[PDB]
Amino acid sequence: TGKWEYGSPKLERYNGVPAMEILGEPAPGLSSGDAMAAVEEIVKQLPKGV
Amino acid sequence: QLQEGVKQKAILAPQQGVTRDLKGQATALVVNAQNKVELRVIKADRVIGDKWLVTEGLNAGDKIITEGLQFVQPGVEVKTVPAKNV
Amino acid sequence: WMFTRIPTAFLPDEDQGVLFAQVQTPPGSSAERTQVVVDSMREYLLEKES
């Protein structure tokens, strides 16, 4: 018998643990280190174990 | 090739209107007379030719989304243009 | 206070000669819907962008 599910078509890993990759761009006119600081500031809300 | 019944006044939705979600059921984005997109629970199992032969949720007169299921989330006021693919 | 102002870049923007146009049809799509998107994009980039 058949049943429909909902799974991912691309599962990638990084150093032996699974992950998902982003492709970020800095703001127009701002430094790349400023964008790196402003994107490592966002990581202060991810669940315990990520 | 024995015939096993007709369904009088049936509904046929394409694959572009019927996509599925995390729970295992089927969804279909319809629009209203208020021109808002609405997600109702469609029930499709059989594929004839290509169109799904549905039994639940959709009646005659509804309009399902067939281009732009990525640009449009349920709750957005849209404008309607007829389709370019079958 | 003139070197503090300007943004920092890793490499300058270059007229390389190529441009990437990666597409993603909605999930559950076959190959011919992607080809209908692709060949229409192709005839737009060749017919009006000669």
Give all chains having 3 or more CB-to-CB distances under 8 Å with chain C.
Answer: A, B
Name chain A contacts of C10, Cβ cutoff 8 Å: 32
Q: Which residues pair with B52 in a beta bridge?
A: B13, B47
Bridge partners (DSSP) listed for residue B28? B18, B40
Task: Write the single-letter amino acid at A11.
Answer: L
User: Is residue B17 a contact partner of residue B64, using CB atoms and an 8 Å limit?
Assistant: yes
d(CA B61, CA B25): 23
Mutate: best of B50, B70, B72, B73, partner C, most C CBs <10 A: B70
Chain A neighbours (≥3 Cβ pairs under 8 A) are B, C
Q: Which residues pair with B35 in a beta bridge?
A: none
Closest-CA distance, C27 to chain A, in angstroms, reads 10
Quick one: resolution in A?
A: 3.8
- In the A/C pair of chains, how many CB contacts fall below 8 A? 9
Tell if the CB–CB gap between B85 and C26 is shorter than 8 Å.
no
Record the tokens describing residue A23, joined without a space.
């492709």
Q: Is A19 on the interface with C (CB under 8 A)?
A: no
CA distance A29 to A19: 30
The tokens for A50 are 């990520």
Cα-based distances in Å from B52 to B38, B58, C33: 19, 12, 18
DSSP 8-class letter at B77: B
- In sequence order, the 6+-apart residues with CB closer than 8 A to the CB of B54 are B11, B12, B13, B18, B42, B43, B44
User: Which residues are bridge partners to A9 per DSSP?
Assistant: none
Nearest of B42, B43, B55, B46 to residue B11 by alpha carbon? B55
Q: What is the DSSP string of B29-67?
A: EEE-TTSBEEEEEE-EEEEETTEEEE-SS--TT-EE--S
Confirm or reject contact between A14 and chain B (CB < 8 A).
no
Q: CA-to-CA distance for B11 and A38, rounded, in angstroms?
A: 51
Q: If you count them, how many residues does chain A have? A: 50
Experimental technique used to determine this entry: cryo-EM
| C48 token code pair | 């009006």
Rounded to the nearest 5 percent, the helix, strand and coil shares of chain B are 0, 35, 65
A6 touches chain B (CB under 8 A): yes
The torsion of the CA quartet B49, C41, C34, B25, rounded to 10 degrees, works out to: -80
Q: How far apart, in whole angstroms, are the C-alpha atoms of residue C25 and residue C30?
A: 9
Which residue is listed with tokens 């299921």?
B69
Please, are residues B54 and B44 in contact by the beta-carbon 8 Å criterion? yes
